[PDB]
Every structure is written in structure tokens, then in C-alpha cells.
Amino acid sequence: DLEDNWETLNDNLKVIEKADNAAQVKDALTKMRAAALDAQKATPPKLEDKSPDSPEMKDFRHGFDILVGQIDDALKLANEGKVKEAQAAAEQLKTTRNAYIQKYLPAPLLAGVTATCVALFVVGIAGNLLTMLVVSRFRELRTTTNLYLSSMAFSDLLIFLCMPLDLVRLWQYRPWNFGDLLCKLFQFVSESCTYAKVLTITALSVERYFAICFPLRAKVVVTKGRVKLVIFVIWAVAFCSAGPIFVLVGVEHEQGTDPWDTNECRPTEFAVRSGLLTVMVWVSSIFFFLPVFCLTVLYSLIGRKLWRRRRGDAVVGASLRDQNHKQTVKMLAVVVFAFILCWLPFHVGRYLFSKSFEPSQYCNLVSFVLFYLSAAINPILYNIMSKKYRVAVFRLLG
């Protein structure tokens, strides 16, 4: 075997370097000759497809000819009794050897982005799990807003569970040998959770607007039941509107190239000649930008009514409802702002990718990072804003 013969060569050169008697150099040089010729008879893994008389093979064997020649000279010098000269011949032998070893056999930014995505993966999983459990095991926190935020927490959870393949595709993009079903599956799930997140935030804000401006809400926003129905329909629309991903993306390779070397997970050719790519990009583009408009107007009205200008001489109180509504509306406002701010470069970059598919680095990387930074940052914002959430977490752990 080539590996066995090579380890044998390095071993006996190691002996020669640390051998005092000339006899030891004689033996080690003889065995190095034997393993050198035996290795020369063997075929390297990089030249097995080429014919035996191919030029590459003749070079690979030529280097071995030079090698065995040096072993012959060193063997003669060792037979004389000159240990120093034979060791020097073993040194130049090591030189030619190493040369033909290395001849026939973004990264820091990758480490940074990957490490950060791992941090957001840990803090994300733990944070959103703590959110769902806090809503689970406490009466005074089973409000409607906490239910919508719990569905959002699960959506972040599933997004982070989809992160690994997205990161593998982030650095390892030349080959995709994982399969077609995965290439469609993880992006389908990720997009579905995107739609569920945006629709859940929008439904939550609508419920706050109707709750504050129209106190007839007691009949309308009924109970947890309505919230469970809206969550069900939100996830159903997320899955159906993200269905076409199964046709949009796929694995493809060039004509005349090895599939194991040129397979990629990208929008298919049929997904481009028919504007399924542009159609889907405009679908999610509406799915993000339109609810951004709705959130802006709705929170504008909520802030207009709650934070209304009052004459300083006001003698009547504050009604004790606008206080709690100001708390939860503060929290939700910060959450929505972080959402838009984080997923804006993502949808911007996807728009640029769609428009470029019809004839930089830190932009795509910062979008990749921000996308998960939202999912990880929502529980942190819950811990900072809501005192009840903080008390519930500290009550669960300590």
C-alpha cells in the first residue's frame, strides 16, 4: 500500500537521522529502497483514470526514479562508512520526497459568521424555549399577546433548526450532495416560518388596535380559542403560500461535468424561464412589506390614542388601562421595530437576487446574520421589556 510504504520511508529516514552506527544507516537505506520501488509500482489515486502511459503517470514515476537513485548514492556512502554524508543524502532525499508529497496530494470571516450564528443558535433555542415554557406554566401570563408571541417563539425555534443546512450552504456552496428533498425541504420550512412570523405579528398588532380603540373587543376577541384558530389559519397560509418552493428550488449540475463536483441547490431552470422565481420573490415581498405598512399604520393609531397630548392642567386621571396598554404596546413596538430592522436587509438582498437572475460579501453575510438575530433577539427583548417575563424566568430557574 502507498500509505504503508510512505510511513515506512518516513520511519526509516527517522532512523537514519537518529542512527549512530553506519550499519543502521545501511539497513534503513536498504528498506527505504525496497519500499520506494514497491511504492513506485503502485498506482496513485489521482492518476487511476488516466492511462498507464499518460504523461502525468510518467512524471509521478520519474520522481520515484530520482528518489531511488538518491537512495542508491546514500547506500554507497553508507557502505563506505561516512555516516554524515549518507545522512545528508537522506536530507536531500527528504527534500525531493516532500516536494513530490505536496505535488501529488473568507475563511476568517467564515469562522466569525459561523461562531456568531452558533451563539444566536444557543441563545435562540434557549430563549424561545424559555418563552414557550413561561407561557406554559404560569396563569397570569396566559394572555392573548403571550400566545401570539409563543407561536412566534416556536417559529424562531424551527428557523434555528433549519439554520444548519443554510450555513452549510453558506460556506459549502460548490457541492450539494445532501439530496434534492432536503434542498427543497429546509427552505420550504424556513420560508413557512417566515410567513407564520409576519402574519402572527400582524394579527397580534391588529388585535391590540381593536382591543384599545374598540372596547367592544370583549365579544370580538373572544378567548384563547380565537387565537388558536388564527394561529391555525396563519400556519396553513404559511405552508400553502410557501408550497411552490418544492418546485422552485432543486439540485442541478452543468452538462459534461461530474455531478459530485458541480451539484448545487438553487432555483431550477424551469423555475426561471417561467417566472416562478420572480413570482415567489414578489409573494414573500408582499408577505413582508405589506404587513410592515399595516404595522406602521396600526401602531401609529395606537400610539396616537394612548400617547395623546394633554393639557398640563388636566385634572382627570389616566384610567389605569392606558398604563398596562402602554407597557405591552411599548414592548410590542420595540419587538416590531427589531423585526423590520433585522429582516429588511434579507428581503432587500432577495429582491436583488431575483432582479439579477434576469440579464457584495458583507451585504449577504450581514443579511444572513440579521435574519437569525431577529429570532434570537425577540426573547432578549421580552426579558428586558416585560418585568413579568423576567420574574417568570427567574422563578422557573432560580
Epitope: 395623546r308 397630548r309 394633554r310 393639557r311 398640563g312 392642567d313 388636566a314 385634572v315 382627570v316 386621571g317 384610567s319
Partner: antibody
Framework: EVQLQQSGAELVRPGASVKLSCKAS????????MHWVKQTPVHGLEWIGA????????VYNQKFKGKATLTADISSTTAYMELRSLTSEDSAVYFC???????????WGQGTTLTVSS | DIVMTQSPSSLAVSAGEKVTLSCKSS????????????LAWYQQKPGLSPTLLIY???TRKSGVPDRFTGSGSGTDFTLTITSVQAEDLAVYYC????????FGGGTKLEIKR
């Protein structure tokens, strides 16, 4: 232009009740507070109470507590004051005052004359 | 409850002459948070409703002639008319806004002819 139209004069029998009105026009009815002032020749200007039309919360003076009841309707943009257990001391000139957000501006009505006698 | 007391009750003066009215409160009307003395001066002419002249006890409402000048702090306030005119025939009240509300006894201004 901001204008407040109060109710006409009232001649109420002693012991009965009455409810005065104050029709506000020319501004956002929910933004400005609505106060009520009782004017008598003996006691001068007496502050009855105030009400916020958006929340409905009221506040009264310790003297007119229970005597007066301030209400408000947003669809009609009209304030009301109910006076119960009327006597001759209640005969007076009642004003409604919309207090602008700008503390330099306030708006008075023409006044309602309450005469209570058998 | 804050009680207001004005002085004098009745005051006669000629045309163009100076006039000084006083409004004393039973409690300080200074809000240390807003740094404003919530004290207003109203002019009620006979047959009409009171109109605002001075708010914050030193700030003149837009449109009011500059001859009306209110001053004072704490519990003592004044309304000064530098050049009284025949149009100034009215009763001047002072309303506090520190607590709920309270008007003063009023001051009837009569001009001499």
C-alpha cells in the same frame, strides 16, 4: 371656529332634578376637557367639576359631590350635567368650559339659567 | 381645597391711569416639576363670559394688549394695567390650576369721567 351651545333656561320645581347640555363644535371632542362652573351672586364663580370625553372619567368639587353628575356623548359631541334634589340654592347660571390643550385658550358657553321655585 | 381671595373688591380709576390688582392663595401654586405658577387672570365684562388674559401668572395670551401684565409667585399674584381704558370696565377674577380649580372673589373696575 370653536362654539359651545348650552341648553335654554330652566324653571324646575323644588325637589325635582334637571339635566343640562353643552353642544361642542369646531374641534376634536375627545381632546379637550369639559368643566362646569356655577355662578351665583352670593358665592361668585364656583367650580363644579370636570370630565374627559374620551375616557369618561370625572372629578368633582367636595361641595358639589353627589349633587352634580357629569356625563358626555362622543357621537353627538355633547356634555351633560344632572342636578338632583334641587332647592332655591341651586338657582344659578351654569357654564360649560372646554379647556384647549394650549393652556392659553379656553372656551365658554353662553350659560344656562336655572330657576328653582314652586 | 385651595381658597382664593382678591383685593380690592371695588376700585375706581381715571382713564390712562395705572391699576394694580392682587390675588392671594391659601396654598403655593408652584409646580417644581413644570416650573410654572398655574395662576390665570380672567376678564368678565357684564353680560359676557370670562375671557383669559394671563396664564402661568406671567405669560400674556396672544391678542391681549401688552398693558395687561401679570406677575407674582407662590401665594401672591398681581394683575397690572398700565394704561386703563374705558373698554376695561369689567370684573377681573383669578383662577388657580394647581389643584382642581378655584376662582377668586373678583375685582370690579370702574373708570372715572
Amino acid at each position: 371656529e370653536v362654539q359651545l351651545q348650552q341648553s335654554g333656561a330652566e324653571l324646575v320645581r323644588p325637589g325635582a332634578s334637571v339635566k343640562l347640555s353643552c353642544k361642542a363644535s369646531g374641534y376634536t371632542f375627545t381632546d379637550y376637557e369639559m368643566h362646569w362652573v356655577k355662578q351665583t351672586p352670593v358665592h361668585g364663580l364656583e367650580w363644579i367639576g370636570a370630565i374627559d370625553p374620551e375616557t369618561g372619567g370625572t372629578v368633582y368639587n367636595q361641595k358639589f359631590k353627589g349633587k352634580a353628575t357629569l356625563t358626555a356623548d362622543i357621537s353627538s359631541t355633547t356634555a351633560y350635567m344632572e342636578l338632583r334634589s334641587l332647592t332655591s340654592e341651586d338657582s344659578a347660571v351654569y357654564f360649560c368650559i372646554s379647556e384647549d390643550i394650549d393652556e392659553s385658550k379656553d372656551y365658554w358657553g353662553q350659560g344656562t339659567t336655572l330657576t328653582v321655585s314652586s | 381645597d385651595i381658597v382664593m381671595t382678591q383685593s380690592p373688591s371695588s376700585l375706581a380709576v381715571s382713564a390712562g391711569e395705572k391699576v394694580t390688582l392682587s390675588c392671594k392663595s391659601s396654598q403655593s401654586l408652584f409646580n417644581s416639576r413644570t416650573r410654572k405658577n398655574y395662576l390665570a387672570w380672567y376678564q368678565q365684562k357684564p353680560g359676557l363670559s370670562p375671557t383669559l388674559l394671563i396664564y402661568w401668572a406671567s405669560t400674556r395670551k396672544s391678542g391681549v394688549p401688552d398693558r395687561f401684565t401679570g406677575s407674582g409667585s407662590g401665594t401672591d399674584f398681581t394683575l397690572t394695567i398700565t394704561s386703563v381704558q374705558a373698554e376695561d370696565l369689567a370684573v377681573y377674577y383669578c383662577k388657580q390650576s394647581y389643584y382642581l380649580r378655584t376662582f377668586g372673589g373678583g375685582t370690579k373696575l370702574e373708570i372715572k369721567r
